[PDB]
Design a protein around this ligand. Sequence first.
Ligand code: 5MA
Lengths: 400, 554
Amino acid sequence: ETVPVKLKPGMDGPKVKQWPLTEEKIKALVEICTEMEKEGKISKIGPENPYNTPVFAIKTKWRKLVDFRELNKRTQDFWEVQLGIPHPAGLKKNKSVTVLDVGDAYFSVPLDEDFRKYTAFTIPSINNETPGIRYQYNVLPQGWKGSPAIFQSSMTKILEPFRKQNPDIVIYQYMDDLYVGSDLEIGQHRTKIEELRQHLLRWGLTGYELHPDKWTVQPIVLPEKDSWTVNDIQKLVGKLNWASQIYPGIKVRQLCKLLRGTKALTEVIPLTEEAELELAENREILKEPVHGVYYDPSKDLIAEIQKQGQGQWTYQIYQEPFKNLKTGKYARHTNDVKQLTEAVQKITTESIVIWGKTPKFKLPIQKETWETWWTEYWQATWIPEWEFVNTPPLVKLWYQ
Amino acid sequence: SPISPIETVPVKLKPGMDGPKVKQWPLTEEKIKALVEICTEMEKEGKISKIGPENPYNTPVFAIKTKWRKLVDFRELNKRTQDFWEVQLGIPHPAGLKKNKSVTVLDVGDAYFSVPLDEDFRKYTAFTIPSINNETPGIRYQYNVLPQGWKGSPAIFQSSMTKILEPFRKQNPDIVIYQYMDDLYVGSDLEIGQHRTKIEELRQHLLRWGLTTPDKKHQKEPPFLWMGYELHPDKWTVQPIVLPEKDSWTVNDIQKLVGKLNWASQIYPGIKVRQLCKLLRGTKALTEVIPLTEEAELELAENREILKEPVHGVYYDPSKDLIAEIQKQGQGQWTYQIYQEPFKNLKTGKYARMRGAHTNDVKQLTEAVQKITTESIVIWGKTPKFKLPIQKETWETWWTEYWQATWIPEWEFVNTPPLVKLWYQLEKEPIVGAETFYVDGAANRETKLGKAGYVTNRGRQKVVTLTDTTNQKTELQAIYLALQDSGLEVNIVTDSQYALGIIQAQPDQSESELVNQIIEQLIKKEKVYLAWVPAHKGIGGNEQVDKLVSAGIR
Ligand SMILES: NCc1cc(Cl)cc(Oc2c(Cl)ccc3c2nnn3Cc2[nH]nc3ncccc23)c1Cl
């Protein structure tokens, strides 16, 4: 018995263009889809289905990735409020969190007949030889936020003996993945994951290891200097001027005093003691969390990334600009696009662990280069929302 | 003519909408007679069927002229019919075609009329031949087949042709079949005999499903004229391009010239269109004569020379890699050629784009690489190997220091001048024994009057008044002043992120003449260090320029 799925009123299904795919990805998808069809998971469709969702291939085995971003936004009432999955606050406090792919579970649950048309996707051909190969889903699709929402009840039943036997193990389902946390020693943790895989293995379903307790802030670092130049104080005042827009209690009055008259940039200007007091007092505030900043569940999360050079990237997560919920850094035969996708995926997984939702990314790359290359390195089964931004020149050095 | 026994495509109207009920306008006797003759003939062929008066839907009919044709106005029905999936997401490019031993063109005869319409949807296609004047009830018909001018026809036909071709495709994987509108383009590497036989097997499989195709004597011979292209057995080209000789060029003639040159640009290398396009800038009428500028005349002449002798492209060999070569032509103009075997181009193209107001050759080159990469994935399903007029060192220096994630796939330097370079570079640290200029600009929002100036550590000073200005313009003007009065080495301190931002990206070309003047200065300089400070915080020299430029302004 299929659960009926109703779209958000006033808006209809997704009509998103399929991106050009290489020959190897097309052939990989044709092979996958021929197989799913024989198994009745998907069916070939007619032209009377005007809907479309993009499809991609990722990795040694090729796997299908359906971009349900638009369908998910259009079904938000269903998966978020109607059939919401509660996020545990304890997960971010665990010594180890193991991420397990549980997407194969969804293929055993039939999709509501009157919702299937909205899961439409096309396999394109090279040089437009043939019209695309069109399919729709007959079962809960991987990548659609409604799939874990519907499967919720079956997941609870599967995990019930395990949860009863392990009361201090946190299990969170987000999209196609299970997040399993414990404060156990690494060996005992890995032993309990194998036990859970055995439980999953009895219902069909078949890792990636995080350490959230070791996740720490990227404080705005103020230099430690032997001798300070006019240029160094100027760099320091701008950096402090901006940190004061986010942190309660920052002061620059004493440091600003030093900058009197029109001086040469290289002039070594001997420091004071009250200026030294400011530095140390600001340093103290900079290492601690931001006072008065709390996550609002009704608001979207934003992630900002800056290229810092030498394979280093900085990022900030916020809901209101300046108001940082989390800051961090990512460090690397790796290119900028490969480094950027790795950072996006790392920031998303931390965001899932901490808030139970993905951020919208502000990416310092050209829309087109990102659109051509992102899949070459993408490894997750989810895709966050993203925008293309032109990184302001000073945000970079203030986060350096 | 047959009507395919294929399964019908279920069609629906848009939710909350009923079929059309649009009144038939009284027709002339000659029009009524013409329609009656047309309709009785289509009814006998199975195309339409007579209906009772119980059906409340109606679409208007018209007839136009020794033969007459029936025009059905499906505008109302089309507005009420559901949306269909897009027919094709692109059109095949000749350069993506592989060379086959034999290829034949099969056009399907009376395509839409050869495929049935959803029985439950036929009622909405109802039309009336009016009787002479008001008088008596009209003759009523509904369609049994896909009507011409109906929304769903292109999609339903294509979908029907796909379901039909399916079993034939499975049992013949070494046969290429292109689906284009009501045509089939069929290619194989079999010797004449078994190709002619496979064509007959195809034709016969098609007739079993209601579709008629031409036979050996009626089927077209190469070169195939198709979509402005010429497809020969060993090469392809664009159809003849004739650039008119005119005494006076109108907007319409220039627009037609640009379209022709753009079309030729796919296979003829070096085609330029920048100077011809510039003429189309402004509020100018279709028939308004535009005098050709010197540059437009020069560009026209260069193009006539390129087009003088015929140029062809070759077909794709899937075993070889694709090589893409790019050259800088000038004023934001780039040109490229794609080949597999040195100098036998599969295709050519051009790139010219203003991606912002301020740019450089390094950014333009990456934009052209991305545009070519996209195109290769569409045409060939693979990215090409690039040969670029930029040194690995220039690229490495640029990618490393730029704020944006930028990447070029597998490439090699090729010494084809003009080479792509960075014209200047900003210092990383303040210069010792160089004058520090503190710059500022201020502009009054009501009067649009502004001031640009500088105070130095060497006690120097200047203030210039500006008339129809903006804060941004004054801040850039202030940087220009400092650059003009400094000599070989400078340290500049601005409170403008906007100005800092532009200069840091190392532009070499701009839409702003002021930015171009700043550029021509930066190039001349030996060393420039540019720094930023927050405004109105009482910072050193910044507070001093602020008072100077603010006087009589803010
Ligand atoms: N209707 C245009 C048309 C458009 C499209 Cl997009 C495809 C078409 O059909 C071809 C096929 Cl099926 C295969 C190779 C082709 C084709 N066309 N050119 N070449 C390369 C080629 N190989 N061998 C040839 N022999 C003769 C002519 C071209 C030849 C046709 Cl005719």
